[PDB]
Design a protein around this motif. Structure first.
Motif, PDB file in Angstrom:
ATOM      1  N   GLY C 167       0.750  -1.240   0.000  1.00 17.46           N
ATOM      2  CA  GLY C 167       0.000   0.000   0.000  1.00 17.46           C
ATOM      3  C   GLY C 167       0.785   1.299   0.000  1.00 17.46           C
ATOM      4  N   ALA C 168       2.106   1.220   0.141  1.00 16.16           N
ATOM      5  CA  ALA C 168       2.957   2.417   0.181  1.00 16.16           C
ATOM      6  C   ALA C 168       2.959   3.147  -1.134  1.00 16.16           C
ATOM      7  CB  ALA C 168       4.367   2.038   0.530  1.00 16.16           C
ATOM      8  N   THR C 169       3.132   4.464  -1.096  1.00 17.57           N
ATOM      9  CA  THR C 169       3.151   5.203  -2.347  1.00 17.57           C
ATOM     10  C   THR C 169       4.600   5.491  -2.711  1.00 17.57           C
ATOM     11  OG1 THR C 169       3.126   7.666  -2.320  1.00 17.57           O
ATOM     12  CG2 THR C 169       1.376   6.509  -1.060  1.00 17.57           C
ATOM     13  N   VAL C 170       4.971   5.037  -3.901  1.00 20.16           N
ATOM     14  CA  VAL C 170       6.316   5.159  -4.398  1.00 20.16           C
ATOM     15  C   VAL C 170       6.399   6.198  -5.480  1.00 20.16           C
ATOM     16  CG1 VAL C 170       8.231   3.878  -5.416  1.00 20.16           C
ATOM     17  CG2 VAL C 170       6.517   2.710  -3.979  1.00 20.16           C
ATOM     18  N   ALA C 171       7.572   6.803  -5.607  1.00 16.74           N
ATOM     19  CA  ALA C 171       7.817   7.791  -6.641  1.00 16.74           C
ATOM     20  C   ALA C 171       8.950   7.283  -7.549  1.00 16.74           C
ATOM     21  CB  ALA C 171       8.213   9.096  -6.013  1.00 16.74           C
ATOM     22  N   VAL C 172       8.700   7.206  -8.848  1.00 15.04           N
ATOM     23  CA  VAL C 172       9.764   6.785  -9.749  1.00 15.04           C
ATOM     24  C   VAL C 172      10.231   8.016 -10.525  1.00 15.04           C
ATOM     25  CG1 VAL C 172      10.423   5.381 -11.688  1.00 15.04           C
ATOM     26  CG2 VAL C 172       8.811   4.493  -9.986  1.00 15.04           C
ATOM     27  N   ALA C 186       7.690  -1.558  -8.626  1.00 10.14           N
ATOM     28  CA  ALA C 186       6.965  -1.037  -7.472  1.00 10.14           C
ATOM     29  C   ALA C 186       5.641  -1.791  -7.354  1.00 10.14           C
ATOM     30  CB  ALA C 186       6.712   0.463  -7.639  1.00 10.14           C
ATOM     31  N   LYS C 187       4.896  -1.832  -8.456  1.00  8.58           N
ATOM     32  CA  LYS C 187       3.610  -2.513  -8.494  1.00  8.58           C
ATOM     33  C   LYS C 187       3.756  -3.979  -8.081  1.00  8.58           C
ATOM     34  CE  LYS C 187      -0.213  -3.580 -11.675  1.00  8.58           C
ATOM     35  NZ  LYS C 187      -0.980  -3.995 -10.459  1.00  8.58           N
ATOM     36  N   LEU C 188       4.849  -4.608  -8.502  1.00  8.98           N
ATOM     37  CA  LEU C 188       5.082  -5.998  -8.164  1.00  8.98           C
ATOM     38  C   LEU C 188       5.433  -6.181  -6.692  1.00  8.98           C
ATOM     39  CD1 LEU C 188       7.095  -7.284 -11.266  1.00  8.98           C
ATOM     40  CD2 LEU C 188       4.769  -7.929 -10.612  1.00  8.98           C
ATOM     41  N   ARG C 189       5.749  -5.091  -6.009  1.00  2.00           N
ATOM     42  CA  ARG C 189       6.089  -5.189  -4.600  1.00  2.00           C
ATOM     43  C   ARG C 189       4.924  -4.740  -3.732  1.00  2.00           C
ATOM     44  NH1 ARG C 189       9.394  -8.707  -3.194  1.00  2.00           N
ATOM     45  NH2 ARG C 189       9.395  -7.569  -1.184  1.00  2.00           N
ATOM     46  N   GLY C 190       3.780  -4.501  -4.373  1.00  2.00           N
ATOM     47  CA  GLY C 190       2.588  -4.106  -3.645  1.00  2.00           C
ATOM     48  C   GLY C 190       2.409  -2.624  -3.393  1.00  2.00           C
ATOM     49  N   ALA C 191       2.958  -1.799  -4.271  1.00  2.00           N
ATOM     50  CA  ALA C 191       2.831  -0.365  -4.099  1.00  2.00           C
ATOM     51  C   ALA C 191       1.408   0.085  -4.386  1.00  2.00           C
ATOM     52  CB  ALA C 191       3.799   0.355  -5.020  1.00  2.00           C
ATOM     53  N   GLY C 192       0.943   1.061  -3.618  1.00  2.00           N
ATOM     54  CA  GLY C 192      -0.384   1.586  -3.845  1.00  2.00           C
ATOM     55  C   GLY C 192      -0.240   2.658  -4.907  1.00  2.00           C
ATOM     56  N   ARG C 193      -0.236   3.906  -4.469  1.00  2.00           N
ATOM     57  CA  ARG C 193      -0.099   5.028  -5.379  1.00  2.00           C
ATOM     58  C   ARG C 193       1.318   5.066  -5.930  1.00  2.00           C
ATOM     59  NH1 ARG C 193      -1.446  11.306  -3.749  1.00  2.00           N
ATOM     60  NH2 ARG C 193      -1.769  12.070  -5.884  1.00  2.00           N
ATOM     61  N   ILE C 194       1.435   5.342  -7.221  1.00  2.00           N
ATOM     62  CA  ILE C 194       2.737   5.416  -7.856  1.00  2.00           C
ATOM     63  C   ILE C 194       2.807   6.679  -8.704  1.00  2.00           C
ATOM     64  CG2 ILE C 194       4.361   4.314  -9.415  1.00  2.00           C
ATOM     65  CD1 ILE C 194       3.109   1.647  -8.768  1.00  2.00           C
ATOM     66  N   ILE C 195       3.727   7.575  -8.353  1.00  2.00           N
ATOM     67  CA  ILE C 195       3.894   8.812  -9.099  1.00  2.00           C
ATOM     68  C   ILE C 195       5.129   8.692  -9.971  1.00  2.00           C
ATOM     69  CG2 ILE C 195       4.226  11.286  -8.992  1.00  2.00           C
ATOM     70  CD1 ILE C 195       3.000   9.699  -5.879  1.00  2.00           C
ATOM     71  N   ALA C 196       4.909   8.652 -11.277  1.00  2.00           N
ATOM     72  CA  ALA C 196       5.997   8.546 -12.237  1.00  2.00           C
ATOM     73  C   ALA C 196       6.335   9.944 -12.729  1.00  2.00           C
ATOM     74  CB  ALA C 196       5.583   7.666 -13.408  1.00  2.00           C
ATOM     75  N   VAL C 197       7.629  10.203 -12.880  1.00  2.00           N
ATOM     76  CA  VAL C 197       8.108  11.499 -13.339  1.00  2.00           C
ATOM     77  C   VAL C 197       8.850  11.385 -14.682  1.00  2.00           C
ATOM     78  CG1 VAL C 197       9.495  13.497 -12.725  1.00  2.00           C
ATOM     79  CG2 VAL C 197       8.338  12.176 -10.963  1.00  2.00           C
TER      80      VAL C 197
ATOM     81  N   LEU D 305      -3.981  -0.528   3.183  1.00  2.00           N
ATOM     82  CA  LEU D 305      -4.784  -1.488   2.437  1.00  2.00           C
ATOM     83  C   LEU D 305      -5.900  -0.778   1.672  1.00  2.00           C
ATOM     84  CD1 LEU D 305      -4.865  -4.698   4.485  1.00  2.00           C
ATOM     85  CD2 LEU D 305      -3.021  -3.397   3.426  1.00  2.00           C
ATOM     86  N   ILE D 306      -6.300   0.389   2.183  1.00  2.00           N
ATOM     87  CA  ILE D 306      -7.337   1.210   1.557  1.00  2.00           C
ATOM     88  C   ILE D 306      -6.792   1.773   0.247  1.00  2.00           C
ATOM     89  CG2 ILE D 306      -8.257   3.555   1.664  1.00  2.00           C
ATOM     90  CD1 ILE D 306      -9.008   2.797   4.655  1.00  2.00           C
ATOM     91  N   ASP D 307      -5.562   2.279   0.284  1.00  2.00           N
ATOM     92  CA  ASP D 307      -4.961   2.818  -0.928  1.00  2.00           C
ATOM     93  C   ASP D 307      -4.827   1.700  -1.950  1.00  2.00           C
ATOM     94  OD1 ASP D 307      -4.611   5.213   0.586  1.00  2.00           O
ATOM     95  OD2 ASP D 307      -2.848   5.690  -0.614  1.00  2.00           O
ATOM     96  N   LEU D 308      -4.500   0.495  -1.483  1.00  2.00           N
ATOM     97  CA  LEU D 308      -4.373  -0.646  -2.380  1.00  2.00           C
ATOM     98  C   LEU D 308      -5.677  -0.863  -3.136  1.00  2.00           C
ATOM     99  CD1 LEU D 308      -2.217  -3.385  -0.633  1.00  2.00           C
ATOM    100  CD2 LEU D 308      -1.725  -1.935  -2.600  1.00  2.00           C
ATOM    101  N   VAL D 309      -6.779  -0.977  -2.395  1.00  2.00           N
ATOM    102  CA  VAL D 309      -8.085  -1.177  -3.018  1.00  2.00           C
ATOM    103  C   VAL D 309      -8.439  -0.011  -3.927  1.00  2.00           C
ATOM    104  CG1 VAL D 309     -10.546  -1.254  -2.631  1.00  2.00           C
ATOM    105  CG2 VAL D 309      -9.013  -2.644  -1.236  1.00  2.00           C
ATOM    106  N   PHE D 310      -8.315   1.193  -3.385  1.00  2.00           N
ATOM    107  CA  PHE D 310      -8.613   2.418  -4.110  1.00  2.00           C
ATOM    108  C   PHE D 310      -7.888   2.456  -5.453  1.00  2.00           C
ATOM    109  CE2 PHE D 310      -8.053   6.894  -5.219  1.00  2.00           C
ATOM    110  CZ  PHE D 310      -9.342   7.416  -4.992  1.00  2.00           C
ATOM    111  N   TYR D 311      -6.565   2.286  -5.426  1.00  2.00           N
ATOM    112  CA  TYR D 311      -5.776   2.325  -6.659  1.00  2.00           C
ATOM    113  C   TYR D 311      -5.932   1.081  -7.531  1.00  2.00           C
ATOM    114  CZ  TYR D 311      -3.954   6.715  -5.067  1.00  2.00           C
ATOM    115  OH  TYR D 311      -3.883   8.034  -4.668  1.00  2.00           O
ATOM    116  N   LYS D 312      -6.893   0.249  -7.162  1.00  2.00           N
ATOM    117  CA  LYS D 312      -7.205  -0.944  -7.926  1.00  2.00           C
ATOM    118  C   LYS D 312      -6.072  -1.942  -8.008  1.00  2.00           C
ATOM    119  CE  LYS D 312     -10.505   1.824 -10.465  1.00  2.00           C
ATOM    120  NZ  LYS D 312     -10.997   2.432 -11.756  1.00  2.00           N
ATOM    121  N   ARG D 313      -5.468  -2.241  -6.872  1.00  2.00           N
ATOM    122  CA  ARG D 313      -4.397  -3.212  -6.846  1.00  2.00           C
ATOM    123  C   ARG D 313      -4.979  -4.560  -6.411  1.00  2.00           C
ATOM    124  NH1 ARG D 313      -1.453  -0.021  -9.874  1.00  2.00           N
ATOM    125  NH2 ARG D 313      -0.581   1.808  -8.793  1.00  2.00           N
TER     126      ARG D 313
END
Ligand SMILES: NC(=O)c1ccc[n+]([C@@H]2O[C@H](COP(=O)([O-])OP(=O)(O)OC[C@H]3O[C@@H](n4cnc5c(N)ncnc54)[C@H](OP(=O)(O)O)[C@@H]3O)[C@@H](O)[C@H]2O)c1
Ligand SMILES: NC(=O)c1ccc[n+]([C@@H]2O[C@H](COP(=O)([O-])OP(=O)(O)OC[C@H]3O[C@@H](n4cnc5c(N)ncnc54)[C@H](OP(=O)(O)O)[C@@H]3O)[C@@H](O)[C@H]2O)c1
Ligand SMILES: NC(=O)c1ccc[n+]([C@@H]2O[C@H](COP(=O)([O-])OP(=O)(O)OC[C@H]3O[C@@H](n4cnc5c(N)ncnc54)[C@H](OP(=O)(O)O)[C@@H]3O)[C@@H](O)[C@H]2O)c1
Ligand SMILES: NC(=O)c1ccc[n+]([C@@H]2O[C@H](COP(=O)([O-])OP(=O)(O)OC[C@H]3O[C@@H](n4cnc5c(N)ncnc54)[C@H](OP(=O)(O)O)[C@@H]3O)[C@@H](O)[C@H]2O)c1
Ligand SMILES: [Zn+2]
Ligand SMILES: [Zn+2]
Ligand SMILES: [Zn+2]
Ligand SMILES: [Zn+2]
Lengths: 352, 352, 352, 352
Positions: C167-172, C186-197, D305-313
């Motif tokens: 669920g952690a939010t990562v920045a690439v 990141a997605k494969l490690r269970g990242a929630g929000r992902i901000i790509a730059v 876990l909420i961010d996970l669901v929210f971000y459709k993971r």
């Protein structure tokens, strides 16, 4: 070439075999000082690891290089070295995964007197010399060096697997030469209070010497009972298993607190299973982790313990309660290990 | 109440403030022993942490609880306590992330002489007593105990962050009392060889005591060359930074081998950036991890380090080179820290 | 034998060398599919790794074994294999430390186009076949498999070094091919929000496809400001550097919260130092860890990514935006990588 | 106020009590959605946790804050929130050791329907709202949200404890909703191949839906056998236990290769001890770490876990096979869990 060996389960006795030949990467070593181990007593007089035939024993030894293969580059003949009881094939997938202890099958890393001729012979083989041998510094006494190949490494692993935190209080179940090296290990992982469990008087001194802060004799009431008492019901942060019944596991699980760790470096010979107390394990949710692994081997594990000894971080000589001269005394030493006298910790047979 | 406070960047003195009042979860404590820190000097003579006005300095002390909130359950008036330099607010998301040092904001865990009056006063407030106070065993002396709150916790943290493996060789850059505890911590983590860097004789003498096996003086030329030569080009497994200017970081990266860690616990009070050398950091792929964090605070942290001292795993008293008596000597000890005389490590002021 | 090589800094051309020969443990492979890398552009036109003389470039390839040493047990000639950009010699001290990437020295695990002729030759060499080659499943196309040797293993290493938590939010930072694989990682490690730059439209669409949930263009204001806005002042949990100037490091340290990680996989080719913000790095105590590592190589590393492509957890094919036929195009493609057109992610040349 | 409660072992029914009142830090909540849990069955008709008297059952719910203590700062009446099955007292030492689940006692972190009145009531108490509550984004459906408090956190935790590495092949023993989330969990940890053990058709499609690649019906032979065949004698990298008998522990260890990990999240209700095969555990040196712990709770856990669901993971909604309207059906919903129908994975009850 002559040498001690397990004839068949329960049957021991010297034999005669060929002076092994060094592969282009291997090396042939001549024993300078060796020692026996309860491990042999288990596999021989209890078939913990099935049966074998005329397999020279002994995994613990320091010695000199007689001859090296064409490819060996960091060892000349006449070099003094510490040979780790663990000499894995370094080119397998297990290694890439990070487990040389099981390179090529479970426990495969352990070759000497398990799946290969041991160190109890006028000569012995060592696979991959540059990866599995370590230069022995002259400053380190022979009887001390021989404690590294298997006692120090196994014991220390104990402390490593336990994830000891600075000041944490640790319990070391069993104070034999291995258990004792676990007490030293814990001190080295910065443990605060160390509670050693054992009765053999001489061991109790060693334990206190290597760091034990509280001795708990398993003949003054149950162990779990006595520890919860010393720790005031809190328990212990980590508990290392270095000897005892298959039920020792059940004891360890109960003395460690939740989120604690049960680090096992003991070798269980009999019993078809090992039990885990359903309740004290929080029905599987108490967060008490159980670990158990073959001790590390290879040149590095050895170069590093050397330093530990060299820089006087530890002194394993205190484990040597008996020193025998000349080859012949291998059988004496071996047996002296069978029916453990009461003044014994670890015997060392010097050869040259 | 009277207290030694920062009046305005570059000015210090004794002022008059109300005796603080405890909330249901706090405790009011009177100092039995306190000590000045390089830190305060930075925030007073460098304005490294913005400005402040009449902020009682000091954050290292052992005291006696004077009064407690209605909800405090483990501390009563009269209790002699070891007070952590870091008194975090234990109910934040940072805590749930495992970083109480940053509970409420970067470094917010550190309240005394930061954003809350320190210990250099007749009385001082401790928030969440049950979570931030530890009982001080009578067996441990004041001058040793007053080392735990900051010097010991920080030093050991450098060690912790280094991810030191049994037998590895570590370098400790900077051997002030903090550097000194890092050496101690290095030894506590099973470090083999320990290269300590510094020049002040008293430090080099203490370093040897706490475990340093090699001394390198930055005054005889570049640390990197001396260390690379001491290690025959192999470099060190870990480097704890406990001093030096900003360019010490580069030095760290250069002496650590690929895959090693540079652990930082030093307070860089001047400069805009810290430089990491490209080539020596493998142009970003050398696997040289760089760490840098504030010292751990709270009850458990303190209890554990106390155990280390209690069970004689460490004796911080060797860091104390000057002990004065009475409140009036706070100012003296403090100045004794601004202008570092050659025979100083850490001074302690006994108050009763 | 013909092959595209680096004649010297700023100079690239077609040269001639002998079809290499295989020692008892190697294999000779012929290129089926190859791709150019930004890494070669740096070393050449920037001499970031120093001078190089007459060295065949390229290190991303899948091909067919043409011949193997008398000791290669798992690979016959004719075998289609995915060759890792990193082929360390598995018998060194670094390998026993857990860093095959620096087996024999810093970055020494990376041989092709570094300190050994690369894969842009009619034939190329592979040291340690059973340890450095992975069989290519027929179900994986050439254009996709060649994304595994370097792009997939590097981008994923970013995600690995980041210590991502569910669920952690990562920045690439930087969404080039590597960056794109970092996003997937990141997605494969269970990242929630992902901000790509990034800013290249083709790249942006690619990021959204591999998991980007937000896109920050570094031509709409400073990155830090934008990311601090998307995260509402909280910052990100980890930042994976995958491209940019030297100053990108500072951007990373400013956007990640205390206790977060800065995982770098980018390879800096210019500048003497890499700046670290003193304050935003909490003066060295903000617990913001910085990591930078060379992508994993070897057989296991390849088998694991093969599996990820096989069980459809990731599809690298989207990275490939240009495919060409013919050994002469290695150049067209290489130059394509030199002056990056707006619509290029990754170019691949098919030879057979 | 009414509530569905455990009157004693085997005796369930509705009761009336005084609507609870909040302490200055707590919050009172009314359910919007709730769900029965197999766990409650175990503690009622099995007394797997001793006996209880008139304790409102249920611990999985999402509701709206009805009122808060004068100290609650981040939550207000009307605020829709997800409520973690685990709500510890965040001011303990267990918390300081990093194990909130066992705050103040083993599993003491899990209060609802354990040592505190559960969620099956027109109202319930949530201690320490600011630490134990997370806002629920309007965008997430109620049936989806009510899955996060227990199923998701536990299943994911299994995958977390598993120490899964990219491309690794994981085995999930038991595909109940928990196991279903363990699978998605292993998918989220970046696993490649995932072998799911189970036979209920509805669960089998859910398992394939969340990432399973291989299904193992415990009907076509021994689990141990099929997995070995499927992994061609190699075994699995990690084994996640989310179901079965006490013997399932044995199966697990038997299928994970040396150096692998067995992670349990399964709540055992019957039995005294869990068996560990002395041989497959390599006589205790196999390096097959075994973990098992009560699922994480608290705000952060829920936010992540909420961010996970929210971000459709992850789309937990596919776990919801039965939806019921009206507060009254709570009882039927519970029974539906006692006698496990064959088309049910997880029943939910929407109140309003
Ligand atoms: N496979 C390998 O390569 C390898 C390598 C290294 C070590 N190991 C394992 O590690 C063991 C090391 O032990 P060791 O040989 O030094 O000595 P040991 O005889 O195996 O163990 C002695 C210790 O266990 C205590 N003990 C005996 N029964 C006990 C019980 N029921 N409960 C609690 N403690 C009990 C002893 O107490 P007293 O003092 O009262 O006798 C003593 O403290 C090896 O035997 C082997 O199992 C295996
Ligand atoms: N922020 C906090 O709350 C907090 C709390 C506790 C601790 N700390 C940290 O702990 C430290 C406190 O200071 P301290 O007690 O360590 O003593 P110090 O006097 O600040 O540092 C002394 C060490 O630095 C050495 N040194 C000076 N210049 C050097 C150079 N150019 N190269 C290499 N070494 C050099 C000294 O050598 P000589 O003997 O020649 O001078 C000695 O080894 C700080 O780093 C601070 O960050 C911070
Ligand atoms: N040594 C090895 O074996 C190895 C292996 C793999 C990768 N690597 C390293 O990883 C990189 C691989 O290539 P790549 O996929 O990263 O593509 P690239 O073309 O090297 O990098 C592209 C990314 O950097 C962005 N960028 C450029 N300047 C920036 C700035 N100032 N701030 C933020 N972003 C900026 C790009 O923006 P635009 O969209 O405008 O381009 C894009 O997002 C190289 O640097 C290489 O050295 C090394
Ligand atoms: N205390 C807590 O906070 C907590 C939280 C989360 C989870 N848990 C524990 O984890 C459990 C799992 O969730 P659940 O109850 O929804 O499912 P469940 O009914 O406990 O488990 C169903 C799974 O177990 C399989 N199974 C049944 N008997 C088996 C056997 N003999 N061998 C192998 N597999 C067998 C089922 O196979 P079929 O397909 O054949 O049915 C299915 O895959 C929880 O109920 C609880 O016990 C506790
Ligand atoms: Zn042995
Ligand atoms: Zn300080
Ligand atoms: Zn590359
Ligand atoms: Zn439950």
């Amino acid at each position: 070439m002559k040498g001690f060996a397990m004839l068949s389960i329960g049957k021991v006795g010297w034999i005669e075999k060929e002076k092994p030949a060094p592969g282009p990467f291997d090396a042939i070593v001549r024993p300078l000082a060796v020692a026996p181990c309860t491990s042999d007593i288990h596999t021989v007089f209890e078939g913990a690891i099935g049966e074998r035939h005329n397999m020279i024993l002994g995994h613990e030894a320091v010695g000199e290089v007689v001859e090296v293969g064409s490819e060996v580059k960091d060892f000349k003949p006449g070099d003094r070295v510490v040979v780790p009881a663990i000499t894995p094939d370094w080119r397998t997938s297990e290694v890439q995964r990070g487990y040389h202890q099981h390179s090529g099958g479970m426990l495969a890393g352990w070759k000497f007197s398990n799946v290969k001729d041991g160190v109890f012979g006028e000569f012995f083989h060592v696979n991959d010399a540059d990866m599995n041998l370590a230069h022995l510094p002259k400053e380190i006494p022979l009887e001390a060096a021989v404690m590294i190949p298997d006692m120090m490494t196994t014991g220390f692993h104990g402390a490593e697997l336990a994830d000891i935190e600075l000041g944490a209080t640790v319990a070391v179940l069993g104070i034999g030469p291995v258990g004792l090296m676990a007490v030293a290990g814990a001190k080295l992982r910065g443990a605060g209070r160390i509670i050693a469990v054992g009765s053999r008087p001489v061991c109790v001194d060693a334990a206190k010497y290597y760091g034990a802060t509280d001795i708990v004799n398993y003949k003054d009431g149950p162990i779990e009972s006595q520890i919860m008492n010393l720790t005031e019901g809190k328990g212990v942060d980590a508990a290392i298993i270095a000897g005892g019944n298959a039920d020792i596991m059940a004891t360890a699980v109960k003395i460690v607190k939740p989120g604690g760790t049960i680090a096992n470096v003991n070798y269980f010979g009999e019993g078809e299973v090992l039990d885990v107390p359903r309740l004290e394990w929080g029905c599987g949710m108490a967060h008490k982790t159980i670990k158990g692994g073959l001790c590390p081997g290879g040149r590095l594990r050895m170069e590093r313990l050397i330093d530990l000894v060299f820089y006087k971080r530890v002194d394993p000589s205190k484990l040597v309660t008996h020193v025998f001269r000349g080859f012949d005394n291998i059988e004496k030493a071996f047996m002296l290990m069978k029916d453990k006298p009461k003044d014994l910790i670890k015997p060392v047979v010097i050869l040259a």
